[PDB]
Amino acid sequence: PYNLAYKYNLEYSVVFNLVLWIMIGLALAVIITSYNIWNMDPGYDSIIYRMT
Amino acid sequence: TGLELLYLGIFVAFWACMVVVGICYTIFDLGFRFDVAWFLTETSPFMWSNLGIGLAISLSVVGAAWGIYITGSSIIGGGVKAPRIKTKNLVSIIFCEAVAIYGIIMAIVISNMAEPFSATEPKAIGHRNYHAGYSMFGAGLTVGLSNLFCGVCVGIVGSGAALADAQNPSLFVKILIVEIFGSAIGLFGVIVAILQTSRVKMG
Amino acid sequence: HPPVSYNDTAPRILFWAQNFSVAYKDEWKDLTSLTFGVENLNLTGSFWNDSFAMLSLTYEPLFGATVTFKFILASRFYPVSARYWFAMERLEIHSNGSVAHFNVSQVTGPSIYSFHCEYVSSVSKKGNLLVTNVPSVWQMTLHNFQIQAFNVTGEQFSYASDCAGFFSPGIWMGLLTTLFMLFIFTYGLHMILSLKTMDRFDD
Amino acid sequence: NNPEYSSFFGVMGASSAMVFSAMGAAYGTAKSGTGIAAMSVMRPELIMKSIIPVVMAGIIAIYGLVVAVLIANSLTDGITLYRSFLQLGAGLSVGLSGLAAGFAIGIVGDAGVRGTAQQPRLFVGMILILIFAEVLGLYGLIVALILSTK
Amino acid sequence: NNPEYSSFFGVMGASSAMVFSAMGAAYGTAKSGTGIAAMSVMRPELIMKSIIPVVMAGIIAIYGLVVAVLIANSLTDGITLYRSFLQLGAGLSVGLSGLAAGFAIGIVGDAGVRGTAQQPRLFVGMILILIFAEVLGLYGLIVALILSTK
Amino acid sequence: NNPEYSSFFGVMGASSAMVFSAMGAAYGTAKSGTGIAAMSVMRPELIMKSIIPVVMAGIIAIYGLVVAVLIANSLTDGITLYRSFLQLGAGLSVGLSGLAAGFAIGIVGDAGVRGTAQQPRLFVGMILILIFAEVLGLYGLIVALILSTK
Amino acid sequence: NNPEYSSFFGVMGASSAMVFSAMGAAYGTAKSGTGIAAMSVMRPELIMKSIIPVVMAGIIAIYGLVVAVLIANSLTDGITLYRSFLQLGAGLSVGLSGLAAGFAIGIVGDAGVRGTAQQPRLFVGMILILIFAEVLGLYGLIVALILSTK
Amino acid sequence: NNPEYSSFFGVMGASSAMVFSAMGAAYGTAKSGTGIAAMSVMRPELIMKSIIPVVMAGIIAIYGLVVAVLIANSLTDGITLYRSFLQLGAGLSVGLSGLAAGFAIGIVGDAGVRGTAQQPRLFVGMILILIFAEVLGLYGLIVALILSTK
Amino acid sequence: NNPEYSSFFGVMGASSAMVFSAMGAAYGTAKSGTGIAAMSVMRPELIMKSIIPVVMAGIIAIYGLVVAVLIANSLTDGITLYRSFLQLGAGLSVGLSGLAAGFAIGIVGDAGVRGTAQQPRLFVGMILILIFAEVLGLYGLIVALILSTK
Amino acid sequence: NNPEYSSFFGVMGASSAMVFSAMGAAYGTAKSGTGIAAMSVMRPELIMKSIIPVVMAGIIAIYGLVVAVLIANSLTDGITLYRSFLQLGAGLSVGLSGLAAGFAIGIVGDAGVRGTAQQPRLFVGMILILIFAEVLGLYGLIVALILSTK
Amino acid sequence: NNPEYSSFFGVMGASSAMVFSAMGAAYGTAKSGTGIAAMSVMRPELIMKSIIPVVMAGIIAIYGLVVAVLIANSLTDGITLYRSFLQLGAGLSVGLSGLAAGFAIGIVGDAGVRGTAQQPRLFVGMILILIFAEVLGLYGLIVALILSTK
Amino acid sequence: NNPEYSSFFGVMGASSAMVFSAMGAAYGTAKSGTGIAAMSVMRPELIMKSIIPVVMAGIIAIYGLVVAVLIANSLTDGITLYRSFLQLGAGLSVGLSGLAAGFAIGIVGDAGVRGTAQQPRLFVGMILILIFAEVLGLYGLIVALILSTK
């Protein structure tokens, strides 16, 4: 009709930062923990080092 | 190394986000929302001043500690078969602390000129306070970084000289030339930090 | 819901709002029924020129006398960016030979877009349209304000440069400080983690 | 006039001022402890002397506290941004200086503890260098104090 | 007039004190444990004579929990942002100081538990070294009590 | 009144509340069970007496599960900022607490099972270290029961 | 009235719930396969006993599929922020819990596979560990279903 | 009438789906072929019996092609953004599923092609493992059609 | 009307389409050249047979060459967002599918050439594997073509 | 309403057209010489014959020059969005194709010169290999013309 | 009316023309220096013939200096931002091309100078590789001039 | 009037001008000193000569001064954005040029000290190389002047 605006609401400029930083922190934490749990030293004891 | 990989990942993600955001905004004719004036006018001069004040001592202390450990470890280790080197080789430690002394004096000097004001909008504050805050931040940053690199170089050469002196007594008295030439860059940093803020009249 | 247009041989000033209500002694009352469809509204005091605008709404006898709300908007050529921005410079109220200034602050958009700001009331959950203390009368709730001035084309109402906030005025300062602390905490963590020990034991 | 965002900076300054010093002292004590463990087996008699590097690291903790209460004795609801950032600067200065002093104390304490085990005469020299390490904390405290009044 | 988001910051304090606290009590209670195994094979008599570091790590965990429970008990929905800042600062200080204390007690225990098996005298020294780390933890508490009262 | 997007946090704290804790539990098993295998080639008699680390990793997991359900069943179409933000805090707290406890439990189980393959006398003391880890799980739960509840 | 991109999170729910579950199952199968290849060449008798770490690992994928079909078929055109956030939480929950569970099955499968080559009596105990190593995933599925019930 | 994203997301889904399928299948077939080439050095006479893993890797890329063509066919210029989001989700899901499955097939196939040269009894067991990887492939289809219909 | 920036996505699509094919054809030749150089030192007879991999990577180059030309053949100023999106999807799909195919071609070619260095008749089976890699890229060339016609 | 100042992107195209491609040539040389001198320890009589690997590297540089000029020859004040984007596409395509070609030729020459050091019979066949690497560069230029011409 | 901030870009262009190129030439001498440390200790007589890489690095620096001076000289107040972007592109172009040339020159000079100690004939090969390694900077300079003058 | 943020750019330029010069000078001096100390054991008579490198590095520090003073004298409250951009460009150019020159002198001196320790005829040759490094630094100075007093 008159091409109204989308109704972008106030206080959004704070929620964006809040959610962004929380998401970044949580993603980084899961990344680091899974990464460390992958490169894991089983020990290389008489079960592992031994073969044949 | 996991930590280096983490740092690289964060850095690359940050710069990729910056590049993509910049390109889409520039193509989108939205250059009117990039008003750097608002970015560098909303910030209070006192934030810039106080960040400079903190750094002007923090980085100097960091450099002093770096040089202290780097020379002290070798001084203590190398004297087992030559206790004579304990007292001959104390010049390096003295300079490693003189760096922090210069840092503290500069912190005291720049700490002056902190009279508050009452303006709360950019049009009322004026140019003078903005100049004051920026200049004080710059002076603090330059003095801190100069003294940091100075202390590191001093500590490295002090370690080298202390370690070499245990072989022949007639070495150290001439190897200290590089040790003395170390401090000149920190002196230059202090001089420039002095000069940058010689015309601030905040208040 | 049609908007209000000032027809100076062409569309020149356009105004729209989903709420616009007023209170004299804290009795809020409806005024959207008295606008946006009433063609006999007092627009005699309104004026137009390129780079200047007044929109004066003198509402009909209510509470003993007609009440006039006068929006004063101006635009000027900004040198550095080489563009044309505007801002509603002032707001006045005329009832009985009395004047005030509910000064407008957080309004500026280029001549390519219109404005939008939800719940711009003026009082407690707004924080603006300030009256500079001496608070006498005339609270006024505007919600979903919209405007275009100093050049229009037809009846079309274009996309809006909403000032909902790029990031914010203050969280930039907060984020700078916290990131600066974060770097130092990472310095601490790198050396606290990568400490080392000895193996077996000296006899 | 002053928004509600003000005391943010002062409170974080108060927290960091002590957090960094605590971390530095902790690292110094850790390094000195492992050094003592290495030193002990051959020369027990020096044990009660080789505590000297450890207590030295502990000093840093107390220094942080000298500011960590002080800034907390001046905070109030009606505080301007200027005083808040002054507090922040003091806190950052003292905290980072404490961190650096803790690192240096730990390293030189380990080195001297290892050294004395094979040469008792080294003892004197060790303490001397350690004096400088303590001074690293002291300067970092001093500026903070004069940033709490002006 | 108070902003809605304010309480958020205080709530994060209710997390943060505990969040890092347990982490410190996971740095030590594990590592020192390995130590008490390494010589239970040979000198099992000293299994219970050097378990002190683990108890101290539990004590830093308690130091975190006290501030956490007080933080939660001082909760409301219309909190002014200043009290929120204070609360989060207290939580952060306690958490990070506890993490550092846990680190130090852990590494010192893992060293001293091995050291004690080569000579008995070292035991006395460690009863000091460990306690020095513990001092840091106590210090954190004090500052929190100034940030929850002033 | 209540913002409609406010439900976001009301669920997000639930997700983290299960994830972090559970993930640490994985770490725990990956140092306990593996260790048993290394010690189960020569002392095959100590198979059933080395399951305790696994059941404690189970305990630290169920802590995260129970808190997650407790903070997830309160959700509805009109969540208020107060409750949602409390759930975020509680979930983050318990998740990171469970993570740290699981890590410590894993290291303890590995070292203890390695040390029990040559001298049974260690065993009881081993269990002692383990309980010092399990209670850390409980610590997280405490905060989560006083933030999500009120 | 509702946001235009509100269904994004609804689709992302099923997307994550399927993808991370599949990733975990695939990794478990891969590492278990490496284990069988390493171990069974010496001992062909166990070519049908090390199959459990794979087939019991594959249950993760079926769990993820069970969640994903429901999430995909529970999306309408009129979705608000509340429902979409519920779906997002459920999907992320199952994905990350299944990742951890897959990891645990992979490592414990390697351990049990290489331990069963020595003595058959390690057939029983290891499988018991495996039960808990899969429950680390099972728990998660449960809560996600609640986040789709409302 | 419709936004500018009415067709960006369909193409992004198609492109990313096919790209991820290509990467996964390439890695799988390449790893299997390297295994075959290294195996052929001692026992070249078994090349024609070990082409199975390469085809088992490529079949999932056939499935990715099917889904890519399908997401292509349903794309026009008057489609609501709902279907755009849905098709992007389906494309990304099938792409990552194919990637994971192909990588697992590659790892198992290479290790097992190396292993089988020393024991004929291995031949049967591996084939079963391969079918399990193939199971993941069909699971992708179980979602790939679903998001196309609702 | 059509926004003027529409051509951007089709342009970058064509560019990426050819660029990724270039990278793949570079990787393929890079590995296979090392393989043939290693092989050719001791048995020069097989050289005629071992030129195949690079000749084949040339076809992966052609795959992107033709598609880029076809994409650019339908670009002008009055392009709607639609056809630009379609060109981008086609280009990226072909480019990265060719990249993956070239990667597999290179790895398998180098390994197989090294294997055939001793026993030439592996060229019978090796070559079959090679074909599959190319065929993977062909899946791309169809899909992109379809997205260039609709 | 002409486009604002799009000419930026236009110039950037020219930059890429040699920033990557020329760089690729550099890499090639850094490998080819690194081969040649090694090979010169053995056969000092074939130095001249071993420079043909270098020569083609230079050729790819010339491509990254010529196309670049054909961009900078069209520059004016009133470049529209259309032409500038076409310049960007051409430059990116040719530059990155040249980079890939440079990597390939560098690796091939390095391996090949050392390989041919021992057996001349390789050399002649190897020339064909090198040619195809060069041909990749050729293809790049072609695409970067066809897009730029429309 | 062209804006004032547009000039900024132009200034930065000059900076690149003296920063990036310079760094390249740094390598172009530095590595060569350590090469001499291995050459003249046994074969010092050739030192005078080993200065060529250093002269090439000086030539790279000369190219950087001439373009930087040309860019800086033409600068003025009333610039159209298109001119500024053109200058920025030329400066970046020459800087990165000179960087590539310096890297290649340094590595080639190092290899050749170490290799000549056992081949008296390496001089011609070193020169004939160096011409190609240095032509890159010349091409970058040519295009930089053709851009800037236009 | 002028904008209120003009002086910020000049401030940052003046700071960087000395920061980078100091870092370069520190690195060069440290490496020259280490080389002298290492060499001094075997050839005590060359100690004076090997100081020629270190003093060279010092000269770069002076260059920093000649810029940072010059900005600080020409800065005032209300300068225009143009002059601020000019000063920032000059400062950054000289700073990074000095840094690169410092690295060059450091490496060359570290090698040349050794060369003269083991071979007298080396010395003068290396002197030439050191001068070349210095040349780069001086070039930076030139540019800054043309960008400062303009």
Ligand SMILES: *[C@@H]1O[C@H](CO)[C@@H](O[C@@H]2O[C@H](CO)[C@@H](O[C@@H]3O[C@H](CO)[C@@H](O)[C@H](O)[C@H]3NC(C)=O)[C@H](O)[C@H]2NC(C)=O)[C@H](O)[C@H]1NC(C)=O
């Ligand atoms: C709307 O306009 C202003 C904010 O937009 C409010 O404050 C006015 O601003 C003036 C400067 O912009 C204030 O400063 C005063 O300026 C006058 C004229 O130069 C001097 O005489 C005064 O000394 C100076 N300072 C003070 C402290 O008075 C004005 O005070 C002020 N204008 C007034 C009161 O008319 C206004 O409050 C607001 N308008 C009104 C009518 O209240």
Ligand SMILES: *[C@@H]1O[C@H](CO)[C@@H](O[C@@H]2O[C@H](CO)[C@@H](O)[C@H](O)[C@H]2NC(C)=O)[C@H](O)[C@H]1NC(C)=O
């Ligand atoms: C704006 O819409 C609101 C509802 O969202 C209407 O609400 C009334 O607001 C006035 C004051 O502005 C109050 O006195 C009334 O009590 C409200 N009425 C209700 C909630 O029933 C409002 O009428 C709309 N427009 C105007 C001009 O007021």
Ligand SMILES: *[C@@H]1O[C@H](CO)[C@@H](O[C@@H]2O[C@H](CO)[C@@H](O)[C@H](O)[C@H]2NC(C)=O)[C@H](O)[C@H]1NC(C)=O
């Ligand atoms: C100007 O007009 C207002 C009305 O908007 C006057 O209001 C008076 O209010 C009383 C209330 O009982 C009425 O009965 C009177 O008729 C009104 N007039 C007077 C003269 O009292 C108000 O007085 C005037 N306001 C001013 C001068 O500020």
Ligand SMILES: *[C@@H]1O[C@H](CO)[C@@H](O)[C@H](O)[C@H]1NC(C)=O
């Ligand atoms: C202004 O002109 C428009 C467009 O023709 C018309 O619809 C509207 O009624 C006019 N308004 C007034 C106030 O004259």
Ligand SMILES: *[C@@H]1O[C@H](CO)[C@@H](O)[C@H](O)[C@H]1NC(C)=O
């Ligand atoms: C409009 O208001 C003005 C205010 O001065 C008045 O003079 C005029 O008569 C009013 N017009 C009508 C139509 O009431």
Ligand SMILES: *[C@@H]1O[C@H](CO)[C@@H](O)[C@H](O)[C@H]1NC(C)=O
């Ligand atoms: C034009 O704008 C000017 C500037 O304010 C104003 O004085 C004048 O009255 C306006 N109208 C005209 C010229 O019709």
Ligand SMILES: *[C@@H]1O[C@H](CO)[C@@H](O)[C@H](O)[C@H]1NC(C)=O
């Ligand atoms: C309003 O827009 C027109 C049409 O583009 C433009 O020419 C004019 O300059 C603008 N008005 C002002 C005051 O700049």
